[PDB]
Amino acid sequence: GESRFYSLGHLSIQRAALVVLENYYKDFTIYNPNLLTASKFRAAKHMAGAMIAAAARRRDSSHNELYYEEAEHERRVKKRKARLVVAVEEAFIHIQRLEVMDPREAAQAIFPSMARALQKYLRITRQQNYHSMESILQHLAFCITNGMTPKAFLERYLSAGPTLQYDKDRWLSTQWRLVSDEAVTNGLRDGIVFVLKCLDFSLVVNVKKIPFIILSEEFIDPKSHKFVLRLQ
Amino acid sequence: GESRFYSLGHLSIQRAALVVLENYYKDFTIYNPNLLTASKFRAAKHMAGAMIAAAARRRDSSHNELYYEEAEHERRVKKRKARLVVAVEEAFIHIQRLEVMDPREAAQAIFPSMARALQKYLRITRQQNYHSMESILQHLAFCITNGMTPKAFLERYLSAGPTLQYDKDRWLSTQWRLVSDEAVTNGLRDGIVFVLKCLDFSLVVNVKKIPFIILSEEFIDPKSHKFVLRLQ
């Protein structure tokens, strides 16, 4: 359901879809199917077992497992995040900017003191398929080279991040499908919907005309900004 | 499961059971069947739906509804308790020790400013069958007579309290049954079990001999209490 709004001029549905995909790779967090499986297993668990309003009334009166599981998961993520911050700070303190070694070997030197905390954080945030050890070592040597702090190294891993952070095979720009009820060479107009389908997800794009705006002046006298100590 | 230990001499099982029942009416909180129905409905909900160890493993790995429901119930009880304390304090502040009225009419005057908070607290703590409005008004006039504070009035209602606080019909001393594997005129000895059955509950009493204790002196020289500033 991640959603962003974009302004476009007179483009065709093709070219509007192209600008939408540019902004998709720049702006949306990367598609993670592992963040979606909890809702699927919850719906399948409901599949394991007038009347439709009473069943909803019995559901909403029951114990909400989801609230407490989300609070407990958020607490575990904050704990693993604090462990990871401490591990990466005490890993970066082990080397000095100045045995002499290049940033790749310095990254390989200080990585075993942060590796387990990062592995546990990427498992709890379901990001472990996105970062191989080679990728983490390359980004580690990158941050050691450019004088970046532990938090600046760690911002790649703390949040989801957009699609272009990741490896070039993890995004796939050749597998895009454009669904439209009309010809895609037609220009945009108010109320059309076109869908940009990837292999698992889709970008549902509905187009609205930017409204006709009427401006008018009104004069505020700058002498009319007088205030009193009386209460209002 | 409420349990207390008592020391007794050479009594018969009859007379030991009598002393146990004296201490029952003095010491144990009153039998409340409404505090027991949650476990019964939970066991019936398990009745609604090698392998016995794997089922226990799947149970203990699941979401514990009971922990969060007990925490939420304890939070609601603390909130209703705070409402009740504020209501009874601002009820007792409405009259003065000195229209002139006796403590019964003063109790009836200040009771509608505390009645709803007390009703909600007795419902959330499942004590509403134990206190009629007449009983609360008599105890209210009792505390107004004797110069007792709001908290001293309220301690009858905040906790469960023993069986002799309550009305004389709510305890029932004529319906006691003594179960014993031997003759009840026999004296107590080590390891006997006798059961005192009421209509719904029972007092399971197992008797242990108080052990043979061997004392000895050892001499500690009061000059040998010398200490040093050195760390230990």
Curated annotation (Swiss-Prot), chains A, B:
It comes from the Eukaryota. Residues 1-232 are cytoplasmic. According to PubMed:11956595, ubiquitously expressed. According to PubMed:12011995, expressed specifically in testis and ovary. It is found in: Cell membrane. Disulfide bonds: none annotated. Heterodimer with VANGL2. Interacts through its C-terminal region with the N-terminal half of DVL1, DVL2 and DVL3. The PDZ domain of DVL1, DVL2 and DVL3 is required for the interaction. Belongs to the Vang family. It is linked to Neural tube defects: Congenital malformations of the central nervous system and adjacent structures related to defective neural tube closure during the first trimester of pregnancy. Failure of neural tube closure can occur at any level of the embryonic axis. Common NTD forms include anencephaly, myelomeningocele and spina bifida, which result from the failure of fusion in the cranial and spinal region of the neural tube. NTDs have a multifactorial etiology encompassing both genetic and environmental components. Sacral defect with anterior meningocele: Form of caudal dysgenesis. It is present at birth and becomes symptomatic later in life, usually because of obstructive labor in females, chronic constipation, or meningitis. Inheritance is autosomal dominant. This is Vang-like protein 1. The gene is VANGL1.
